[PDB]
Amino acid sequence: DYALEKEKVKKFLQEFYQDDELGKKQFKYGNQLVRLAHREQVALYVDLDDVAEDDPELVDSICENARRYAKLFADAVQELLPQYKQYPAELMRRFELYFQGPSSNKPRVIREVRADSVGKLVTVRGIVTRVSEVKPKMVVATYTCDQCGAETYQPIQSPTFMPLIMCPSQECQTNRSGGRLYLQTRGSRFIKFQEMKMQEHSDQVPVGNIPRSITVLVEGENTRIAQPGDHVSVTGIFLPILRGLLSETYLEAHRIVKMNKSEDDESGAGELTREELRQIAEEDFYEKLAASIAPEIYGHEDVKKALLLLLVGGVDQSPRGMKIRGNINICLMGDPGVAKSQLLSYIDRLAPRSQYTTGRGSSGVGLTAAVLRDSVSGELTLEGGALVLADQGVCCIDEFDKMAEADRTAIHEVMEQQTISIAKAGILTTLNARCSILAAANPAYGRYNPRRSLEQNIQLPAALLSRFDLLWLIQDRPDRDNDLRLAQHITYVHQHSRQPPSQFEPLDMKLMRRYIAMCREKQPMVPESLADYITAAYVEMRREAWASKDATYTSARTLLAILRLSTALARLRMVDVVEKEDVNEAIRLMEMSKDSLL
Amino acid sequence: NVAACKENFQRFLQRFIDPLAKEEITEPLYMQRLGEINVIGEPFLNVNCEHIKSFDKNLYRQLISYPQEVIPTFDMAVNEIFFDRYPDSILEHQIQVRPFNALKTKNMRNLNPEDIDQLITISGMVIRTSQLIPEMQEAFFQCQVCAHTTRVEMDRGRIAEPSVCGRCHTTHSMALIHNRSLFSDKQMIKLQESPEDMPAGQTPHTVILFAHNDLVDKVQPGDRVNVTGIYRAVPIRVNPRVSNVKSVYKTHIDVIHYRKTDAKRLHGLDEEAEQKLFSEKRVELLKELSRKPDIYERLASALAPSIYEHEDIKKGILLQLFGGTRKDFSHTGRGKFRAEINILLCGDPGTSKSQLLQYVYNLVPRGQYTSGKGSSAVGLTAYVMKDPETRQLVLQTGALVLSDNGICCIDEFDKMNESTRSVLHEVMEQQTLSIAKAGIICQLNARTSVLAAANPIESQWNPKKTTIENIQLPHTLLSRFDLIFLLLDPQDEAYDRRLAHHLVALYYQLDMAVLKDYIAYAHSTIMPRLSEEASQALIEAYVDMRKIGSSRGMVSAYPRQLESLIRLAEAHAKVRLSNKVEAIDVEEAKRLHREALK
Ligand SMILES: [Zn+2]
Ligand SMILES: [Zn+2]
């Protein structure tokens, strides 16, 4: 029976201690109930590990039913609220209660949840898809009899409901045997609501099987948490749909947690301590990170110095209404087997918002944005591509010389103005795609050769070559010595499954992903006294590439490299003004990128 | 609630003073507005529901919370303060009141169900409209026995049948006569949130607005508005038969006020009646600025104050914003005559072409921006789509027709296969388009003006070949242009230094409303007619062009150029408001046509 459970839950809600509050033993739910009584809060995430601390039996009979109990709890709190501080007892609820999963249960997959767990508290993991938009869902419909001057209500449970035409008040009927009553959207009560689908990770699927979906009815306070195309973990009851004996089922979410980082959304917990400010304040903080990027890869001391600037990014201006981008694009032309598709796979995992794409397996409308029809409605809708889903992050395109030539000019727009302007036959708009691109490619026919000059063993039209601030050029130079050290590195790796002890142990990925997010928001400036130095450098470049027989196409878009490739450095050193020592680092980079040919 | 508010509103309407300026203290602000309403037609009063926030705070709570039970009071309380001008002018309809807000209030993603049925302001970009839809107000019934015609009103929002003939009493004989009742109008419009003010890596939404009786056709697709109106939500039924309505409602917006303040653009051609609405203090300014010996070079040099010198291209792009006269050739049976100027920009990379297009497209209203490979033959002019609902082929408009008054920037002009390039031959010379497809045989027309940008073949201007070989365009397409700007720019050690010195400056840190109004004026009240002294310099200016362009092999001259000179000459006269074409207005627009290909 349940009448005695409504007391065994009130006990727990009024008695529970907790020490980690940083103070003494306070009441985790004692403060919560007051806040809820003062209408400063809406949801009450009753954890289940805390009930499983003094009563591991109640937890057994919650995850067994979890549908009655989620109502006993919302009655217990309904009674306790007045004791701290209309007709139906649900129109005046103005709060909701959600179960936060018990720690002993294990997160299933979508394929595992079978019929033997209908009506129980489950936990699934997946990728979001097709999240809807918030719409008001009714809970308590309020009607009025305009004739007899009254008010009536009715509560809703199903996804449908039939209204009333009675005015069942026996007085109004008895006096006159006549009268209709109107619906009304003022006295009623709505609640936010949105439905979203989940799919399995295509990784955890049998070798060639089709992924299965599930439906999630987010509502109340969990709305607007999850974005489409996202890794998420959901906790909620698993029920069948109302209205022969077969049944279609949906997951009724009680708790939604983002697990992008492979552990749990810890982006908001990006707090740097003083013991880490120790490191960040060291003389060569810029040089530790550079060595701690993909440590499994020997050599390439300079490429890792630029792949960090790409992750930090310069600053972006707006004078007299003339936007200048503040991202950096980088290409990695080089011989086969130099670990480029390793560097890219690493820079994919070290970025909050990232995307991975292959040139030969992606079409030009699938990068930017595509207009697609719905055979259920005949209506054309937009669907973002790769560069849209990677808005404030990094996109990675390896096998970049093999992408079809009509599917490659769809990037010229995203690399300069950083919008996507669609004018197909359903839509006319400009999406925002502020992504910074990183691509890899093989030079001419697999291998660089010294007969033909540049620009003919690269094969990029100048209009696209100039979009890249740094077209880095590596080689597979077979220097006997350079090969011996490379081999003695890789064999160590295959022995110990680790890299050989370096001068400074690499920082964890979790920690760098925070060191950088703290290092983005500085916005340094430029000092006037430097405009004479910078200038001369640029001028000198326009001389060399004009008085040479190999050099690439340099243009007035190169100056903004020097400028935006130095506000990155000055952003690492945590300065708030660019100094003459970073301009020379930038200038060295733009020179150490084509020396691999001399 | 009703009487208590008109008394509090009349006070506001009478005693209000602001620390502001209008139409370039006259205490009776809204009484002056109400006087203007009397001296002319247009019985609408645009009240700012923030002024009512200074004067009061207990109606500003009841206007944005019960707007449909207040705005009738705000009409009545204005009708009575119209007592001053009651006897003078007696219009018929009624006086109106329209609250609004200078600045937006919400987005399209943060509309929550605590905001149902209360004043709300958003902003977007109208996508598409619909045709009018009637909507009943007063029914009109009639009996089949007594043939007596009662006229019941719709009060609450539904129509009730009487069921008793006031004469014969047959207890149901009152049919509804449709075309004797009273209807009003209703239009359905779709917004689309702007690219600014949307989250990271997401796709635009839409929102449905419903216009009403008088706002029914006050907006066009392609406009940026600040709609203000109530926010409602109405149920839907799962069957069009049963009364089983769903539980997830569906929302729209009953618009109340538009606002198209596009100060980031110039003046669209809906404001030609509004040109007579210029302060006579301003026409003095314009006529006096138009007298300085160089107002040409003083306005031109104020276009895009971020490009470096490029002195001639800004001249051309300034004359393009005026265009030749609009002569009326219907009598001579010739047809019509193009009056807008098409400009082509060819030149080696890095020379800042795409920046000029990106600047113009953001200046002119009613424009588009297209690219090379991401635009097809039919997407630019007109396609035929299988309409989803009615399953019938219907016509639509491309990009060169949606502009129609403005500029159609076509970047990457070279990289369009010769099929989709031969389509511009019609729309850019005759200002027409003749379509003959499955069921559609029609003839559109437009007043667009291309502004194209291309690269030389080989993307490098090699001076070994002839000018008609670096461009590699045919002659039947090069002649439809009339200003082919060859940005021949090498590595001039002085130019590069000056440009770099200019560009760096953008990192430290004439008006518009002069130009933005000078242009509207010079469009509204100017029509340069040729002379006999000007016409006698136009004949030789074409007899020499032939001998010149014949030999060199650069670009031949066909009689069409002799019309372009006209187009250019007249367009120069409009700059200085000269209303008559004289000699110098031909020498200028001849030197411009000659000193662009060198
Ligand atoms: Zn009643
Ligand atoms: Zn009758």
Encode A464-480 in three state secondary structure.
HHCCCCEEEECCCCCCH
Closest C-alpha to A333, from A447, A452, A198: A447
Ramachandran class of A320: left when φ > 0, alpha when ψ lies in -120 to 50, beta otherwise: left
> Which residues, in sequence order, are CB contacts of A331 under 8 Å at separation 6+?
A400, A438, A439, A440, A441, A468, A470, A471, A472
Q: How many CB atoms lie within 10 A of CB A89?
A: 10
Q: Are A129 and A198 in contact (CB under 8 A)?
A: yes
Give A560's contacts in chain B (Cβ within 8 Å).
503
* Cβ density class B197-215: b for 16+ within 10 Å, e for less: ebeebbbbeebebbbeeeb
Q: How many CB atoms lie within 10 A of CB A445?
A: 9
Distance CA A365, CA A424 (A): 12
> Which residues, in sequence order, are CB contacts of B563 under 8 Å at separation 6+?
none
Q: Are B393 and B386 in contact (CB under 8 A)?
A: yes
What single-letter DSSP state applies at residue B165?
-
Q: Give the Å distance between the CA of A91 and the centre of ligand 1.
A: 21
What single-letter DSSP state applies at residue A296?
T
Partner residue opposite A388 with nearest CB, options B201, B385, B507:
B201
Closest C-alpha to A227, from A91, A353, A107: A353
Question: Is B53 in a helix, a strand, or coil?
Answer: helix
Q: Which residues of B are annotated as a binding site?
A: 308, 334, 353-354, 455, 480, 560, 563
Q: Are strands A182-191 and B250-257 parallel, antiparallel or unpaired?
A: unpaired
* Cβ density class A316-329: b for 16+ within 10 Å, e for less: ebeeeebebbbbbb
Please state the φ and ψ torsions of residue A355, each to the nearest 5 degrees.
-150, 150
| Burial zone of A547 (CB within 10 Å; 0-12 exposed, 13-18 middle, 19+ buried) | exposed
Q: Are B167 and B98 in contact (CB under 8 A)?
A: no
Q: Do B195 and A419 touch (CB under 8 A)?
A: yes
Distance CA B58, CA A254 (A): 40
Read off the amino acid at residue B542: Y
Q: Do B203 and A227 touch (CB under 8 A)?
A: no
**Helix or strand (DSSP H, E) at B542:** helix B540-552
Angle at B584 between CA B579 and CA B585, to 5 degrees: 45
Give A137's contacts in chain B (Cβ within 8 Å).
247-249
Residue reference for tokens 């740097």: A272
Q: Are strands A121-129 and B384-386 parallel, antiparallel or unpaired?
A: unpaired
Distance CA A166, CA A180 (A): 7
Beta strand spans in A58-181 (E): 96-100, 121-129, 137-144, 152-155, 160-161
Q: Are A216 and A197 in contact (CB under 8 A)?
A: yes
B330-339 contact pairs (CB < 8 A, 24+): B335/B430, B336/B430, B336/B431, B336/B432, B338/B429, B338/B430, B338/B431, B338/B567, B339/B447, B339/B567
The β-bridge partners of B234 are B250
Q: Which of A134, A144, A464 is the best mutation test for B, with the most CBs of B within 10 A?
A: A134
Longest dimension (CA), chain B: 103
Q: Give the Å distance between the CA of B135 and the centre of ligand 2.
A: 27
Q: Which 206-265 residues of chain A touch chain B by CB within 8 A?
A: 224, 227
Q: Which two tokens stand for residue B425?
A: 């031959």
Beta strand spans in A192-264 (E): 193-199, 213-219, 231-240, 249-258
Q: Are A472 and A330 in contact (CB under 8 A)?
A: yes
Distance CA A410, CA B372 (A): 9
Q: How many CB atoms lie within 10 A of CB A256?
A: 20
> Which residues, in sequence order, are CB contacts of B11 under 8 Å at separation 6+?
B55
Cα atoms found within 13 Å of the Cα of residue A472, Cβ hemisphere only: 23
Q: Do A429 and B350 touch (CB under 8 A)?
A: no
Q: How many CB atoms lie within 10 A of CB B508?
A: 12
Q: Are strands A429-432 and A419-422 parallel, antiparallel or unpaired?
A: antiparallel
Question: Is B389 in a helix, a strand, or coil?
Answer: coil
Q: What is the resolution of this structure in A?
A: 6.8
Question: Is A433 in a helix, a strand, or coil?
Answer: coil
A531-544 and B493-505 helices, crossing angle to 10°: 140
Q: Do A162 and B244 touch (CB under 8 A)?
A: yes
CATH class, domain A274-590, is alpha beta
Residue A149, marked binder = no
3-state helix, strand, coil in chain B (%, to 5): 30, 15, 55
Partner residue opposite A463 with nearest CB, options B111, B455, B500:
B455
The alpha helices in B209-353, defined as continuous H runs, are 280-289, 296-300, 311-319
What experiment produced this structure? cryo-EM
CB contact A374 to B (< 8 Å): no
Q: Do A531 and B504 touch (CB under 8 A)?
A: yes
Residue reference for tokens 């559609």: B440
Q: Do A190 and B116 touch (CB under 8 A)?
A: yes
* Cβ density class B118-156: b for 16+ within 10 Å, e for less: ebbbbbbbbbebeeeeeeeeebbbbbeeeeeeeebeeee
The alpha carbon of A537 is separated from its chain's Cα centroid by a whole number of angstroms, namely: 40
Residue reference for tokens 């609405």: B277
Q: Which 327-366 residues of chain A touch chain B by CB within 8 A?
A: 353, 364
From residue B196, how far is each of A79, A317, A567 by CA, in Å? 47, 16, 25
Q: Do A542 and B493 touch (CB under 8 A)?
A: yes
Q: Do B116 and A185 touch (CB under 8 A)?
A: yes
Closest C-alpha to A200, from A184, A217, A214, A190: A214
Q: Are B553 and B276 in contact (CB under 8 A)?
A: no
Distance CA B452, CA B516 (A): 24
Distance CA B486, CA B312 (A): 11
Q: Are A148 and A169 in contact (CB under 8 A)?
A: yes
Q: Which two tokens stand for residue A572?
A: 């690492």
Distance CA A586, CA B449 (A): 44
Distance CA A369, CA B374 (A): 12
Read off the amino acid at residue A38: H
Distance CA B105, CA B112 (A): 13
Distance CA B81, CA B63 (A): 20
Q: Which ligand has its closest atom nearest to the C-alpha of B144?
A: 2
Q: How many CB pairs under 8 A join A and B?
A: 195
Closest C-alpha to B220, from B74, B354, B405, B378: B405
> Which residues, in sequence order, are CB contacts of A503 under 8 Å at separation 6+?
A291
Closest C-alpha to B504, from A582, A312, A317, A328: A317
Give B205's contacts in chain A (Cβ within 8 Å).
133
Distance CA B295, CA B573 (A): 12
Q: Is the dihedral of CA B71, B72, B75, B80 positive or negative?
A: negative
Q: Which residues of B are annotated as a binding site for ATP?
A: 308, 334, 353-354, 455, 480, 560, 563
Q: Do A391 and B201 touch (CB under 8 A)?
A: yes
The alpha carbon of A10 is separated from its chain's Cα centroid by a whole number of angstroms, namely: 39
Read off the amino acid at residue A422: I
Q: Do A138 and B249 touch (CB under 8 A)?
A: yes
Read off the amino acid at residue B518: Y
A317-326 contact pairs (CB < 8 A, 24+): A317/B506, A317/B507, A319/B306, A319/B506, A319/B509, A320/B305, A320/B306, A321/B362, A322/B304, A322/B306, A322/B355, A322/B359, A322/B506, A323/A417, A324/A560, A324/A564, A324/B506, A325/A416, A325/A417, A325/A418, A325/A434, A325/A564, A326/A564, A326/A567
Distance CA A569, CA A571 (A): 5
The DSSP line for B192-220 is E--SSS--TT----EEEEE--SSSTT---
Return the residue of A nearest to B65 by Cα: A186
Give B200's contacts in chain A (Cβ within 8 Å).
353, 391-392
The alpha carbon of B258 is separated from its chain's Cα centroid by a whole number of angstroms, namely: 14
Cα atoms found within 13 Å of the Cα of residue A533, Cβ hemisphere only: 16
Residue A337, marked binder = yes
| Burial zone of B264 (CB within 10 Å; 0-12 exposed, 13-18 middle, 19+ buried) | exposed
Q: Is the dihedral of CA A163, A169, A170, A173 positive or negative?
A: negative
Q: Give the Å distance between the CA of B183 and the centre of ligand 2.
A: 25
Q: Which of B192, B203, B495 is the best mutation test for A, with the most CBs of A within 10 A?
A: B203
